[PDB]
Write a protein that binds this ligand. Structure first.
Ligand code: 8CN
Length: 150
């Protein structure tokens, strides 16, 4: 009973979380997952500031109100070569990665590793935070509050 959460650097408190190496997070699960990191879904303004500090990914993820990809450099296979906060317009499907915003993180680029999941609750799952440099932090718990997400 295990969940892997791959996380990035934070940029003005915003970071990306990919669950189990595939698009697998619902909008309700995303809010609960950010809450376990003492974080919230970013606002579009928070995401635009993160972008300006150096944040980009090549994966769709929830923010408040939309599903987006922050892009700095044009790449043909990432958001159809767009730059800026690219907003997903048309999709049949509902499951993506998520972004999260931690207000207590540093104001600019923070590429230190994530070493805690401070607000998860009691439960049976082994949750492992996997950093880009491979360092890992694991704890037994749960973060999903909606049974349909379990
Ligand atoms: C200690 C710090 N690197 C950390 O582990 N966190 C803050 C950044 C967002 C997620 C997590 C709560």
């Amino acid at each position: 009973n295990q969940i892997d959460l791959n996380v990035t650097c934070r940029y003005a408190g915003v970071f990306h979380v990919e669950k189990n190496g595939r698009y697998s997070i619902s909008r309700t699960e995303a809010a609960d997952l950010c809450q376990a990191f003492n974080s919230t879904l970013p606002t579009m303004d928070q995401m635009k500031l993160a972008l300006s500090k150096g944040f980009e990914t090549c994966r769709y993820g929830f923010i408040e109100g939309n599903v987006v990809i922050p892009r700095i450099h044009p790449n043909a296979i990432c958001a159809a070569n767009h730059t800026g906060v690219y907003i997903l317009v048309t999709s049949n499907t509902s499951h993506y990665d998520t972004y999260c915003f931690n207000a207590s993180a540093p104001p600019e680029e923070d590429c230190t590793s994530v070493t805690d999941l401070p607000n998860s609750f009691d439960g049976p799952v082994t949750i492992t935070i996997v950093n880009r440099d491979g360092t890992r932090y694991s704890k037994k718990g749960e973060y999903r509050t909606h049974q349909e997400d379990i």
